[PDB]
Design a protein around this motif. Structure first.
Motif, PDB file in Angstrom:
ATOM      1  N   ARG B  33      51.340  71.750  38.640  1.00 18.73           N
ATOM      2  CA  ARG B  33      51.893  71.646  39.986  1.00 18.73           C
ATOM      3  C   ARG B  33      53.250  72.328  40.121  1.00 18.73           C
ATOM      4  O   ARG B  33      53.910  72.190  41.158  1.00 18.73           O
ATOM      5  N   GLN B  34      53.675  73.086  39.115  1.00 18.13           N
ATOM      6  CA  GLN B  34      54.951  73.779  39.176  1.00 18.13           C
ATOM      7  C   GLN B  34      54.807  75.288  39.022  1.00 18.13           C
ATOM      8  O   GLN B  34      55.821  75.990  38.946  1.00 18.13           O
ATOM      9  N   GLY B  35      53.583  75.810  38.999  1.00 20.19           N
ATOM     10  CA  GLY B  35      53.387  77.244  38.947  1.00 20.19           C
ATOM     11  C   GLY B  35      52.452  77.706  37.849  1.00 20.19           C
ATOM     12  O   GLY B  35      52.305  78.907  37.626  1.00 20.19           O
ATOM     13  N   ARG B  36      51.820  76.781  37.137  1.00 26.03           N
ATOM     14  CA  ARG B  36      50.828  77.132  36.131  1.00 26.03           C
ATOM     15  C   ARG B  36      49.485  76.589  36.586  1.00 26.03           C
ATOM     16  O   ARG B  36      49.373  75.402  36.899  1.00 26.03           O
ATOM     17  N   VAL B  37      48.482  77.462  36.661  1.00 24.20           N
ATOM     18  CA  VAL B  37      47.116  77.055  36.961  1.00 24.20           C
ATOM     19  C   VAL B  37      46.191  77.661  35.922  1.00 24.20           C
ATOM     20  O   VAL B  37      46.466  78.727  35.361  1.00 24.20           O
ATOM     21  N   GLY B  38      45.078  76.979  35.681  1.00 25.10           N
ATOM     22  CA  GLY B  38      44.060  77.498  34.794  1.00 25.10           C
ATOM     23  C   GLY B  38      42.664  77.123  35.240  1.00 25.10           C
ATOM     24  O   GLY B  38      42.441  76.007  35.721  1.00 25.10           O
ATOM     25  N   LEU B  39      41.714  78.041  35.085  1.00 23.59           N
ATOM     26  CA  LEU B  39      40.328  77.797  35.461  1.00 23.59           C
ATOM     27  C   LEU B  39      39.436  77.920  34.238  1.00 23.59           C
ATOM     28  O   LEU B  39      39.562  78.874  33.464  1.00 23.59           O
ATOM     29  N   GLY B  40      38.533  76.961  34.079  1.00 22.67           N
ATOM     30  CA  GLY B  40      37.583  76.994  32.990  1.00 22.67           C
ATOM     31  C   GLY B  40      36.208  76.529  33.417  1.00 22.67           C
ATOM     32  O   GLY B  40      36.078  75.589  34.207  1.00 22.67           O
ATOM     33  N   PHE B  41      35.173  77.184  32.901  1.00 18.19           N
ATOM     34  CA  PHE B  41      33.790  76.831  33.194  1.00 18.19           C
ATOM     35  C   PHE B  41      33.135  76.397  31.890  1.00 18.19           C
ATOM     36  O   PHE B  41      32.903  77.223  30.999  1.00 18.19           O
ATOM     37  N   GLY B  42      32.848  75.103  31.777  1.00 21.89           N
ATOM     38  CA  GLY B  42      32.327  74.520  30.554  1.00 21.89           C
ATOM     39  C   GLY B  42      30.861  74.148  30.709  1.00 21.89           C
ATOM     40  O   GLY B  42      30.475  73.505  31.687  1.00 21.89           O
ATOM     41  N   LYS B  43      30.065  74.548  29.718  1.00 20.52           N
ATOM     42  CA  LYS B  43      28.619  74.369  29.733  1.00 20.52           C
ATOM     43  C   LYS B  43      28.183  73.710  28.434  1.00 20.52           C
ATOM     44  O   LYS B  43      28.506  74.205  27.349  1.00 20.52           O
ATOM     45  N   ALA B  44      27.437  72.615  28.546  1.00 17.17           N
ATOM     46  CA  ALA B  44      27.093  71.798  27.393  1.00 17.17           C
ATOM     47  C   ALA B  44      25.798  71.058  27.679  1.00 17.17           C
ATOM     48  O   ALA B  44      25.394  70.930  28.840  1.00 17.17           O
ATOM     49  N   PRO B  45      25.123  70.552  26.641  1.00 13.41           N
ATOM     50  CA  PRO B  45      23.897  69.763  26.861  1.00 13.41           C
ATOM     51  C   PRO B  45      24.121  68.417  27.516  1.00 13.41           C
ATOM     52  O   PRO B  45      23.130  67.732  27.806  1.00 13.41           O
ATOM     53  N   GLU B  46      25.364  67.994  27.731  1.00 10.02           N
ATOM     54  CA  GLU B  46      25.641  66.721  28.391  1.00 10.02           C
ATOM     55  C   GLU B  46      26.911  66.869  29.224  1.00 10.02           C
ATOM     56  O   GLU B  46      27.737  67.748  28.979  1.00 10.02           O
ATOM     57  N   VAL B  47      27.052  65.980  30.210  1.00 16.31           N
ATOM     58  CA  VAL B  47      28.088  66.091  31.237  1.00 16.31           C
ATOM     59  C   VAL B  47      29.485  65.927  30.641  1.00 16.31           C
ATOM     60  O   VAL B  47      30.337  66.802  30.868  1.00 16.31           O
ATOM     61  N   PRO B  48      29.781  64.859  29.883  1.00 20.11           N
ATOM     62  CA  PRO B  48      31.156  64.732  29.356  1.00 20.11           C
ATOM     63  C   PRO B  48      31.563  65.861  28.427  1.00 20.11           C
ATOM     64  O   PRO B  48      32.698  66.348  28.525  1.00 20.11           O
ATOM     65  N   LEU B  49      30.678  66.304  27.531  1.00 25.65           N
ATOM     66  CA  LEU B  49      31.025  67.422  26.656  1.00 25.65           C
ATOM     67  C   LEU B  49      31.352  68.670  27.468  1.00 25.65           C
ATOM     68  O   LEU B  49      32.254  69.437  27.111  1.00 25.65           O
ATOM     69  N   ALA B  50      30.627  68.888  28.570  1.00 23.72           N
ATOM     70  CA  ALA B  50      30.872  70.064  29.398  1.00 23.72           C
ATOM     71  C   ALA B  50      32.206  69.959  30.124  1.00 23.72           C
ATOM     72  O   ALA B  50      32.944  70.946  30.226  1.00 23.72           O
ATOM     73  N   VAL B  51      32.528  68.771  30.640  1.00 26.99           N
ATOM     74  CA  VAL B  51      33.842  68.560  31.237  1.00 26.99           C
ATOM     75  C   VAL B  51      34.933  68.785  30.200  1.00 26.99           C
ATOM     76  O   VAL B  51      36.019  69.289  30.523  1.00 26.99           O
ATOM     77  N   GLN B  52      34.659  68.449  28.940  1.00 28.33           N
ATOM     78  CA  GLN B  52      35.572  68.732  27.841  1.00 28.33           C
ATOM     79  C   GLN B  52      35.798  70.233  27.676  1.00 28.33           C
ATOM     80  O   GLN B  52      36.914  70.712  27.893  1.00 28.33           O
ATOM     81  N   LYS B  53      34.750  70.980  27.300  1.00 30.98           N
ATOM     82  CA  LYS B  53      34.882  72.428  27.109  1.00 30.98           C
ATOM     83  C   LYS B  53      35.544  73.101  28.303  1.00 30.98           C
ATOM     84  O   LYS B  53      36.299  74.065  28.141  1.00 30.98           O
ATOM     85  N   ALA B  54      35.252  72.620  29.512  1.00 27.26           N
ATOM     86  CA  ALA B  54      35.805  73.248  30.707  1.00 27.26           C
ATOM     87  C   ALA B  54      37.324  73.157  30.721  1.00 27.26           C
ATOM     88  O   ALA B  54      38.017  74.160  30.924  1.00 27.26           O
ATOM     89  N   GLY B  55      37.863  71.957  30.498  1.00 32.48           N
ATOM     90  CA  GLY B  55      39.308  71.818  30.408  1.00 32.48           C
ATOM     91  C   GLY B  55      39.909  72.651  29.289  1.00 32.48           C
ATOM     92  O   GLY B  55      41.001  73.207  29.436  1.00 32.48           O
ATOM     93  N   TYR B  56      39.201  72.754  28.161  1.00 28.80           N
ATOM     94  CA  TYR B  56      39.695  73.538  27.031  1.00 28.80           C
ATOM     95  C   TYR B  56      39.771  75.021  27.383  1.00 28.80           C
ATOM     96  O   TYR B  56      40.824  75.653  27.226  1.00 28.80           O
ATOM     97  N   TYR B  57      38.658  75.597  27.850  1.00 30.40           N
ATOM     98  CA  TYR B  57      38.679  76.978  28.327  1.00 30.40           C
ATOM     99  C   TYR B  57      39.728  77.169  29.414  1.00 30.40           C
ATOM    100  O   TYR B  57      40.371  78.221  29.488  1.00 30.40           O
ATOM    101  N   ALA B  58      39.906  76.161  30.274  1.00 31.14           N
ATOM    102  CA  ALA B  58      40.866  76.274  31.366  1.00 31.14           C
ATOM    103  C   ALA B  58      42.280  76.479  30.844  1.00 31.14           C
ATOM    104  O   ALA B  58      43.034  77.302  31.373  1.00 31.14           O
ATOM    105  N   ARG B  59      42.666  75.738  29.807  1.00 29.86           N
ATOM    106  CA  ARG B  59      44.009  75.902  29.264  1.00 29.86           C
ATOM    107  C   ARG B  59      44.150  77.210  28.503  1.00 29.86           C
ATOM    108  O   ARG B  59      45.263  77.733  28.384  1.00 29.86           O
ATOM    109  N   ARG B  60      43.036  77.763  28.025  1.00 28.26           N
ATOM    110  CA  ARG B  60      43.029  79.061  27.364  1.00 28.26           C
ATOM    111  C   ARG B  60      43.318  80.210  28.327  1.00 28.26           C
ATOM    112  O   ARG B  60      43.680  81.303  27.879  1.00 28.26           O
TER     113      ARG B  60
END
Ligand code: SF4
Ligand SMILES: [Mg+2]
Ligand SMILES: [Mg+2]
Ligand SMILES: [Mg+2]
Ligand SMILES: [Mg+2]
Ligand SMILES: [Mg+2]
Ligand SMILES: [Mg+2]
Ligand SMILES: [Mg+2]
Ligand SMILES: [Mg+2]
Ligand SMILES: [Mg+2]
Ligand SMILES: [Mg+2]
Ligand SMILES: [Mg+2]
Ligand SMILES: [Mg+2]
Ligand SMILES: [Mg+2]
Ligand SMILES: [Mg+2]
Ligand SMILES: [Mg+2]
Ligand SMILES: [Mg+2]
Ligand SMILES: [Mg+2]
Ligand SMILES: [Mg+2]
Ligand SMILES: [Mg+2]
Ligand SMILES: [Mg+2]
Ligand SMILES: [Mg+2]
Ligand SMILES: [Mg+2]
Ligand SMILES: [Mg+2]
Ligand SMILES: [Mg+2]
Ligand SMILES: [Mg+2]
Ligand SMILES: [Mg+2]
Ligand SMILES: [Mg+2]
Ligand SMILES: [Mg+2]
Ligand SMILES: [Mg+2]
Ligand SMILES: [Mg+2]
Ligand SMILES: [Mg+2]
Ligand SMILES: [Mg+2]
Ligand SMILES: [Mg+2]
Ligand SMILES: [Mg+2]
Ligand SMILES: [Mg+2]
Ligand SMILES: [Mg+2]
Ligand SMILES: [Mg+2]
Ligand SMILES: [Mg+2]
Ligand SMILES: [Mg+2]
Ligand SMILES: [Mg+2]
Ligand SMILES: [Mg+2]
Ligand SMILES: [Mg+2]
Ligand SMILES: [Mg+2]
Ligand SMILES: [Mg+2]
Ligand SMILES: [Mg+2]
Ligand SMILES: [Mg+2]
Ligand SMILES: [Mg+2]
Ligand SMILES: [Mg+2]
Ligand SMILES: [Mg+2]
Ligand SMILES: [Mg+2]
Ligand SMILES: [Mg+2]
Ligand SMILES: [Mg+2]
Ligand SMILES: [Mg+2]
Ligand SMILES: [Mg+2]
Ligand SMILES: [Mg+2]
Ligand SMILES: [Mg+2]
Ligand SMILES: [Mg+2]
Ligand SMILES: [Mg+2]
Ligand SMILES: [Mg+2]
Ligand SMILES: [Mg+2]
Ligand SMILES: [Mg+2]
Ligand SMILES: [Mg+2]
Ligand SMILES: [Mg+2]
Ligand SMILES: [Mg+2]
Ligand SMILES: [Mg+2]
Ligand SMILES: [Mg+2]
Ligand SMILES: [Mg+2]
Ligand SMILES: [Mg+2]
Ligand SMILES: [Mg+2]
Ligand SMILES: [Mg+2]
Ligand SMILES: [Mg+2]
Ligand SMILES: [Mg+2]
Ligand SMILES: [Mg+2]
Ligand SMILES: [Mg+2]
Ligand SMILES: [Mg+2]
Ligand SMILES: [Mg+2]
Ligand SMILES: [Mg+2]
Ligand SMILES: [Mg+2]
Ligand SMILES: [Mg+2]
Ligand SMILES: [Mg+2]
Ligand SMILES: [Mg+2]
Ligand SMILES: [Mg+2]
Ligand SMILES: [Mg+2]
Ligand SMILES: [Mg+2]
Ligand SMILES: [Mg+2]
Ligand SMILES: [Mg+2]
Ligand SMILES: [Mg+2]
Ligand SMILES: [Mg+2]
Ligand SMILES: [Mg+2]
Ligand SMILES: [Mg+2]
Ligand SMILES: [Mg+2]
Ligand SMILES: [Mg+2]
Ligand SMILES: [Mg+2]
Ligand SMILES: [Mg+2]
Ligand SMILES: [Mg+2]
Ligand SMILES: [Mg+2]
Ligand SMILES: [Mg+2]
Lengths: 82, 148, 99, 7, 137, 208, 122
Positions: B33-60
């Motif tokens: 909220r101060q000028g850093r944004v990140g977008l990630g698209f996470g794909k996994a065989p289950e919903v929580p794991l995908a939400v995980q990878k997504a946040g990880y790719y997002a910070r990358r």
RNA sequence: GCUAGUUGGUGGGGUAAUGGCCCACCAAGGCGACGACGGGUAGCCGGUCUGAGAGGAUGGCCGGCCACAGGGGCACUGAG
RNA sequence: GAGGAAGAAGCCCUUCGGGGUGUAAACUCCUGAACCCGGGACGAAACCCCCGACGAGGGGACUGACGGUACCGGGGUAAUAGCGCCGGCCAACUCCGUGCCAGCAGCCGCGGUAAUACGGAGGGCGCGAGCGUUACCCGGAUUCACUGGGCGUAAAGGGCGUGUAGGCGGCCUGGGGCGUCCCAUGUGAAAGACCACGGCUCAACCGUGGGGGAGCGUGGGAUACGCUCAGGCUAGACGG
RNA sequence: CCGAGGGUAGGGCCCGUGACUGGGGCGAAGUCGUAACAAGGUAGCUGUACCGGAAGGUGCGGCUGGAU
């Protein structure tokens, strides 16, 4: 004849006239020739009457005729002061 | 630290003898909220794991988004194929006027007042990418002056 | 002020009258492009001194006849039969437009 | 409409 | 060739995207007045009259950013965008009150007036409108 | 007219303690501190993830039920702030506070806006000397809100003015307990009032 | 298209076609029932829908839907009709308003009563 | 594709006044893809509704102008 | 209106422990819509008469349909709530009845014996003397795309030439000033809209003032670009 | 003289309707065959022509948006 009269504006039970020059054959709230001041008969504001007096005398000089209760509001504004 | 928002969770499917074998996808935007944004698209065989990878790719993958008093410095048009995003700077009293997908990216950017419009294909995935490239292309008078 | 226009003469075939073809340019109100539009005026030539190809000025005036509302004011150019041909070719192309 | 008519 | 101005802008826009050092355009005074403003505003290093096979050309020297890092090391553009406004198909004429602010000040609008070719800021300060030639940022 | 119905269900739905009753709001009899879950058969079930529309609607119903104002008057006020100059968030709040029935509450004349309304509605209030029985009166800077002379002596107003000898009143306001007077000093700033309401989420609700 | 092409030809205003022509710009229209029968619906539904063929004051004769459970409608019944089709009954473009003329309300409704012409029970 | 008072001229009548507005005669002209002629629909405007604007839609109430007064034709009186 | 139980009855759900409607009601006290009495308007001061001069200026008198209305004063009773909706879009869920029936439906779709989608009920959401429905307009529709779209395969290049009108048109110099740009000036009625203030207790409504544009008339100016006229060039084009 | 209009005669346009007739759309579970989608069991589509209950077939030329 061209006349000087009151064209009632305002709302129901809230009269607000404009002392105005118009053709006598024009309708009361119709297209006038020039506005020479307003008049609040109910005296709901500090200045419920106002006349240009300079213009009110021009039209008077060229042949405009006031109404009977418009003649007063020009008298009460001293249009006739010699 | 960074704040996370889940833009999209969908269930895609492949085929094999015996039926449909599913898989899940997650759009997650992250920012301070101060000028850093990140977008990630996470794909996994289950919903929580995908939400995980997504946040990880997002910070990358992040972006500077040079905020100026809560709005962006200039208007910008960016097309990420068939999908088009309009970003227009706004006055301090306006607000973030955007669809859910851009709004999520702009609020975590720290954008507090902006005008937007999605044109063409409103596919949320491609609108999201189109929003990021737009921010990624914002410059300042400093950037501009330093270039010329 | 009485409107003053400028145009060529596309017809001399009337008594004390010539047809003056005025054109004007303006931008399209929606599509912005500058477009041409022309209009014929039946002008008064009482001395019958004006002829084809003459570029002249006409002035608004009181009606001479029906349809005749302008007087020729002054000559400007002469021998502009190149413009008259443009007019006549167009009117001629109309024969290929029927059915 | 005379007089008989055609129509 | 129907628009020598659209040609020039496009001739530049293609050279900057393959990162050419220079690119020659056919010579004309009005083009010089346009390139004079791109140089003075920093979009190009400048230009110089030349002759190619005996023909007057205008060699334009191009600018780019520093070599970037990451998987694609191509510099940022100094001309991100250069686009014809008024064209032979529809001419575009703005009064002074109608001159657009290009890219909210980060860009310029080149436009020809009866006082010369001017930028959006030059026109507004000088108080005259004219034919909007193009926009650059 | 106004909502006129059960008021503790409002707080239990909005997930926040709205002070719509009076003293009971501060007691352990407060329904919110007793069953802080939404009303009805399903209130104790596990809430599913709300939608963005739900979130904005919930903020709006929150702010609105605070003032006990109908959706018509609520939005006509919202739209007025949208047109006026400046930040629409603050102005919409300020005009909400400028309502007479809210001032009479904010001046401690009554313990609930719902009771402050009936005070205004039965005439027990005046503004700048003149009786004013219109809960929607937009109070301006400088207006002197006072209790009606013919109503100064009344058990409810005394007991309310009594318990008001204790409390202080907002920076934008003024109060003289002995003479039952009160003064509207200025239009409240955003930080001068901390409602449990994110006003931007109410802007965004109408931008749809 | 070129700007000259637009000068020549211009853009064509898209016109909208009414889906309730028998109404002839009216909100509702009176009629009289000629055939009061039931019709089967199209895939993938099965039912016996209640339809009246109505002869209008506007010259048209159309099939209207009779919503709700049970109806008092028969031949020669006077009926007011409103817009609104029944998706699963091709050719039915109108609904009968209930509680109007000779179309009684639905007996023993409690929910959505105003949509079915039933007054509030004590 | 349209046009015989049609388009222009001369003379005259007519009117407060210009004019084929009307009559006599002479000339053969007038208009049209920049949509004439024809068909359909519509009183027009200030404005009103919507819309980021550009635009779209609309013209009830109020104000301005026009048109009509059962359907038509006509003149009289008259500053009108 | 304030108070008012770990919380009545009834009805609903339940794993039979309990949960819900719910401070809601009852109940207590406070207030007092309507209604009753009393007073009672602003709108109305001119024409007129009086003195002066049938004038300027003085002073005087009669007149209210609305209306015994508003409003003020005194008293004074706890005093109508309904409508839509709760599958997703879209805010709100459980039980029973029904069993591709009866029915719902704006689109996708619901109903075939465990239906949050039909019907009722309890609960819930949203508005509130209104709430819904139908019809129609603009919006979302960047889906007639000027702003601001397209045409290999999604709808979309004419079967191909030749060519009329038209649209468009290379480098340099000069004349004009048509487009275009600038300044001044006239018009752009009132109302409305907008900002400010003020009057009806607020508001709607209404009064006062402020700010103006575009378009067109006129006058003055600028000449880069487009146009026209004149003169020159050879990079397009044609020819040997 | 002109003249509302009435009348005679003949044209043009539009709307409604008509024995009968032509196809069209739509309609949970009808009858016939299997033309197309796989080389769909004769590659398909195609303009035209002729024929046949029906899809279709065949001829002439074209296309690959044709398998191998
Ligand atoms: S505060 Fe506690 S008691 Fe007062 S209303 Fe909200 S819930 Fe009911
Ligand atoms: Mg009244
Ligand atoms: Mg008149
Ligand atoms: Mg895309
Ligand atoms: Mg694209
Ligand atoms: Mg689309
Ligand atoms: Mg930066
Ligand atoms: Mg302009
Ligand atoms: Mg309103
Ligand atoms: Mg009292
Ligand atoms: Mg909106
Ligand atoms: Mg079904
Ligand atoms: Mg009938
Ligand atoms: Mg019967
Ligand atoms: Mg409908
Ligand atoms: Mg209902
Ligand atoms: Mg229903
Ligand atoms: Mg004559
Ligand atoms: Mg004639
Ligand atoms: Mg004759
Ligand atoms: Mg003759
Ligand atoms: Mg023309
Ligand atoms: Mg007609
Ligand atoms: Mg009509
Ligand atoms: Mg009409
Ligand atoms: Mg739009
Ligand atoms: Mg608006
Ligand atoms: Mg219109
Ligand atoms: Mg009207
Ligand atoms: Mg009326
Ligand atoms: Mg009118
Ligand atoms: Mg008539
Ligand atoms: Mg009649
Ligand atoms: Mg008659
Ligand atoms: Mg008549
Ligand atoms: Mg209570
Ligand atoms: Mg308990
Ligand atoms: Mg309990
Ligand atoms: Mg109980
Ligand atoms: Mg219980
Ligand atoms: Mg009085
Ligand atoms: Mg008299
Ligand atoms: Mg005397
Ligand atoms: Mg009384
Ligand atoms: Mg009282
Ligand atoms: Mg009392
Ligand atoms: Mg008492
Ligand atoms: Mg009670
Ligand atoms: Mg609803
Ligand atoms: Mg669900
Ligand atoms: Mg909704
Ligand atoms: Mg929901
Ligand atoms: Mg069975
Ligand atoms: Mg049954
Ligand atoms: Mg349903
Ligand atoms: Mg709907
Ligand atoms: Mg069963
Ligand atoms: Mg069941
Ligand atoms: Mg089942
Ligand atoms: Mg259910
Ligand atoms: Mg439903
Ligand atoms: Mg149900
Ligand atoms: Mg109301
Ligand atoms: Mg309604
Ligand atoms: Mg909108
Ligand atoms: Mg549009
Ligand atoms: Mg629409
Ligand atoms: Mg369409
Ligand atoms: Mg379309
Ligand atoms: Mg376009
Ligand atoms: Mg498209
Ligand atoms: Mg081809
Ligand atoms: Mg052909
Ligand atoms: Mg040519
Ligand atoms: Mg040209
Ligand atoms: Mg050129
Ligand atoms: Mg000029
Ligand atoms: Mg005006
Ligand atoms: Mg302002
Ligand atoms: Mg304006
Ligand atoms: Mg001008
Ligand atoms: Mg001039
Ligand atoms: Mg005759
Ligand atoms: Mg005749
Ligand atoms: Mg006849
Ligand atoms: Mg007759
Ligand atoms: Mg006939
Ligand atoms: Mg048939
Ligand atoms: Mg069988
Ligand atoms: Mg087969
Ligand atoms: Mg076979
Ligand atoms: Mg085969
Ligand atoms: Mg075959
Ligand atoms: Mg064949
Ligand atoms: Mg054969
Ligand atoms: Mg073959
Ligand atoms: Mg071939
Ligand atoms: Mg092959």
């Amino acid at each position: 004849m061209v006349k000087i009269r009151l064209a009632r504006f305002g709302s129901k039970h809230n009269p607000h006239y404009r002392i105005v020059v118009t053709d006598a054959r024009r309708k009361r709230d119709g297209k006038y020739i020039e506005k020479i001041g307003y008049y609040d008969p109910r005296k709901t504001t500090p200045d419920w009457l106002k006349v240009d007096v300079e213009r009110a005398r021009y039209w008077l000089s060229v042949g405009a005729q006031p109404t009977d209760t418009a003649r007063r509001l020009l008298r009460q504004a001293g249009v006739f002061r010699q | 630290d960074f704040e996370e928002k889940m833009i999209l969770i969908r269930r895609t499917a492949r085929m094999q003898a015996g039926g449909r074998r599913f898989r899940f996808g997650a759009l997650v935007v992250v920012g301070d909220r101060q000028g850093r944004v990140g977008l990630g698209f996470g794909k996994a065989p289950e919903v929580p794991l995908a939400v995980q990878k997504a946040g990880y790719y997002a910070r990358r993958n992040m972006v500077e988004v040079p905020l100026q008093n809560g709005t962006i410095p200039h208007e910008i048009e960016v097309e990420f194929g068939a999908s088009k995003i309009v970003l227009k700077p706004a006055a301090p009293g306006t607000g973030v006027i955007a669809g859910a997908v851009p709004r999520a990216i702009l609020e975590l950017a720290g954008v507090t007042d902006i005008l937007t419009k999605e044109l063409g294909s409103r596919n949320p995935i491609n609108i999201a990418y189109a929003t990021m490239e737009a921010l990624r292309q914002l410059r300042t008078k400093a950037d501009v002056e330093r270039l010329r | 002020p009485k409107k003053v226009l400028t145009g060529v003469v596309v017809s001399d075939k009337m008594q004390k009258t010539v047809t003056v073809l005025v054109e004007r340019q303006f931008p399209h109100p929606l599509y912005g492009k500058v477009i041409k539009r022309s209009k014929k005026y039946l002008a008064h030539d009482p001395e019958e001194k004006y002829k084809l190809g003459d570029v002249v000025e006409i002035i608004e005036s009181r009606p001479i006849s029906k349809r005749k509302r302008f007087r020729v004011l002054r000559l400007v150019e002469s021998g502009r039969m190149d413009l008259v041909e443009k007019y006549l070719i167009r009117r001629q192309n109309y024969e290929s437009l029927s059915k | 409409a005379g007089x008989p008519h055609k129509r | 060739l129907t628009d020598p101005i659209a040609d020039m802008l496009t001739r530049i826009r293609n050279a900057t995207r393959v990162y050419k050092e220079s690119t020659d355009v056919p010579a004309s005074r009005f083009k010089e007045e346009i390139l004079r403003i791109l140089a003075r505003e920093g979009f190009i290093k400048g230009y110089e009259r030349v002759d190619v096979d005996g023909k007057p050309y205008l060699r334009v020297y191009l600018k780019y950013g520093p070599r970037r890092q990451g998987p694609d090391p191509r510099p940022e553009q100094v001309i991100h965008h250069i686009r014809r406004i008024s064209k032979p198909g529809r001419r575009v004429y703005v009064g002074v009150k109608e001159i657009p602010r290009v890219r909210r000040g980060l860009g310029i609008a080149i436009l020809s007036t009866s006082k010369g070719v001017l930028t959006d800021r030059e026109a507004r300060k000088l108080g005259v409108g004219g034919e909007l030639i193009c926009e650059v940022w | 007219g106004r909502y006129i119905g059960p008021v503790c269900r409002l707080c239990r739905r909005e997930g926040v303690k709205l002070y719509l009753k009076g003293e009971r709001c501060y007691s352990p009899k407060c329904a919110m501190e007793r069953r802080p879950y939404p009303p009805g058969q399903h209130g104790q079930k596990r809430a599913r993830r709300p939608s963005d529309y739900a979130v904005r609607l919930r903020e709006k119903q929150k702010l609105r039920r605070i003032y006990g104002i109908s959706e018509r008057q609520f939005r006509n006020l919202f739209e007025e702030a949208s047109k006026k100059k400046g930040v629409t968030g603050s102005v919409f709040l300020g005009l909400l506070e400028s309502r007479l029935d809210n001032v009479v509450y904010r001046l401690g004349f009554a313990v609930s806006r719902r009771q402050a309304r009936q005070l205004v509605r039965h005439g027990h209030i005046t503004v700048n000397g003149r009786r004013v029985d219109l809960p929607s009166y937009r109070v301006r800077p400088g207006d002197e809100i006072a209790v009606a002379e013919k109503s100064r002596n009344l058990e409810l107003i005394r007991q309310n003015l009594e318990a008001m000898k204790g409390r202080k009143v907002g920076p934008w306001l003024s109060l003289d307990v002995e003479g039952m007077k009160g003064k509207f000093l200025r239009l409240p700033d955003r930080e001068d009032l901390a409602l449990p309401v994110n006003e931007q989420l109410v802007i965004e609700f109408y931008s749809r | 298209p070129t700007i000259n092409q637009l000068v020549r030809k211009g853009r064509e205003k898209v016109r909208k076609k009414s889906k309730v022509p028998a109404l002839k710009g009216a909100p509702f229209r009176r009629g009289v029932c000629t055939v009061v029968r039931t019709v089967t619906p199209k895939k993938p539904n099965s039912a016996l829908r209640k339809v009246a063929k109505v002869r209008l004051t506007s010259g048209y004769e159309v099939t209207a839907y009779i919503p709700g459970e049970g109806h008092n409608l028969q031949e020669h019944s006077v009926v007011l009709i409103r817009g609104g089709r029944v998706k699963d009954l091709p050719g039915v473009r109108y609904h009968i308003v209930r509680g109007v003329y000779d179309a009684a309300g639905v007996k023993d409704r409690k929910k959505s009563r105003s949509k079915y012409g039933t007054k509030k029970p004590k």
